């Protein structure tokens, strides 16, 4: 029903708030206040559903900035094209907002395909956005330019998974890179949208030279450049840590456990960042859901949960790591109503048990999972 | 604030519900129930503005399907280009949703201009959509076709205002017209949007020939063809009335003052339709706000309210005419959450005094005018 009162929840906003009651009205968070020792009087004509959670952890929904919502793959033949990722693979992993992109195969797939799937997910009740462009240069777009795509297509927030330091890249020059960045950046001012360029990094030894040079040589703000897969190898991760002091957000990939290659598992990279006193608000985590992870090995949204369990199991506190999946991502992507359990924000939230497994998932004030039961399924699941 | 309680309100939903209290949650209507007297016990922890309206009339907000949000004109030289229409021109006149369009000048003005203004008005708190094309063939678009415009640009709902039977038209062929109709119609299927073509009618003796012919010879549903300015002359009005038996929605223009010229004032046309027992659900009214009205007059949204008052002073009932500004528009344009005062619909509401003047205006749950005072101005008003 439209009003939902969630009683007795231990809120991580991601900041710890202690035990609270939270009123949801429509798709928004309407109130948060201390859990009174008795009950309240609710006027009878108002339809309100009341649920007592007996102190269970309450969290913002995860914001996954890197999902191949159309499916990725296609890098070892046509038969390796991954089908579309279903609604429940996001929601049951706790992802209430997704940002889709094309990757390596931006030749058989189009931005048309990508944006249609975005709207699909929106009709099914998920919050969804996307990146235009892909790995390659010139860019795959709808209207012919990144600038026009970001200006005129509401869900498109930036340029994404644009490849550098990778054998599958377009070997882009510095001039090409800073022109692209100038286009997302200015379109972001025009629209109020992220206006970032989300870089795919591979294993090339030039690492982040292009980004380091752009920031040094140019007036482009550091935040415009958002590299991902930064834990994929060790030298890269070191450079990415250094990159933090310029102002860049950096994005770890939650690789399926024991597949982090010769780089760092995301949980180890997080622990290292904490030990080292790095600015944790500039670090994010994404799943690479629907992507292939080449030597075939498939990305899925549930690795966010597992990375989080693995960090907690090391003795890191929930408040230290949770912003990496929530408020840190909302910050760089300019999702002003997401990523926080606070009055006026969207009612995107998760409930977890003592083991940190996600039992309940609400998106836009509507339950997609409840008491560990799927409430909402996608059209063809 | 997040919850607002409207007490003692005489609801026309548009259909008369009598005296109610109405609870607003965020941007939605959440409860409607019998007023009664006595307590109302609201929890102290829940922020709720309570407002008493002493029995005053409450209606849905007006939906204006035909507004030059960028300005129209340009038909008697370059100095006659109307400037953009400020937010309050819509809200002070009770328009909570607008559908913008290009007119005669789709040469120096672009869909990019139009769409940018849609997004402008959304940022200021109005609900706004638009038609792509404009008078002329080939169409003025962003992407290169209406099909892909309607499919990929969320606020674009169809094609309009496409000219037939006018000296300023492109003299389109029947083949040209039904091809455009197939385009919006199919895009309406793909997207769930209106999928209509909104035609400008001129004073040509051929009138609605091309639409009559499309409906008779093709499989295209009648609702796809949506002529406006049907009251501009008397033969055209007779023919448009006949067209209602085919299933089409027809659109009256609220010409100002005594400017209906050789046709009918919208108030008379409406009276005639009620006397003739035509299907009134298929009749709408739009302002042409920001347009030029050459033989030269100016459209403005406040003609809507005037036409309403003029029709009630004829002895017509509010519930008979009100749907023509609200629910009948929402129906043809497939604005499933607009046009009605009902639980689950968007909180777009007007309050009127006994003289049918609009004293309050709410758009998406936010007050733009309260107690005869302007609460929100456009960025440059
Ligand atoms: Zn990648
Ligand atoms: Zn990827
Ligand atoms: Zn016209
Ligand atoms: Zn017009």
Author numbering:
A (entry chain A), B (entry chain B): 6 to 300, 310 to 395
Describing publication, verbatim:
This enzyme catalyzes the hydrolytic cleavage of β-aspartyl dipeptides. In the present study, we determined the crystal structures of IadA from Colwellia psychrerythraea strain 34H (CpsIadA) in its ligand-free form and that in complex with β-isoaspartyl lysine, and subsequently characterized its enzymatic properties. The CpsIadA monomer structure contains ten α-helices and eighteen β-strands, and the overall structure is divided into two distinct domains (a β-sandwich domain and a catalytic domain).
A structural comparison between the ligand-free wild type CpsIadA structure and the structure of the CpsIadA E80Q mutant complexed with β-isoaspartyl lysine show several structural changes occur upon ligand binding. Tyr140 interacts with the O04 and O07 atoms of the bound β-isoaspartyl lysine. The OG1 atom of Thr109 and the OE1 atom of Glu80 interact with the N11 atom of the β-isoaspartyl lysine, and the SG atom of Cys297 interacts with the O13 atom of β-isoaspartyl lysine. Residues Arg173 and Arg237 interact with the O01 and O04 atoms of the β-isoaspartyl lysine. The lysine side chain of β-isoaspartyl lysine did not have any specific interactions with CpsIadA. Thus, this region has a relatively weak electron density.
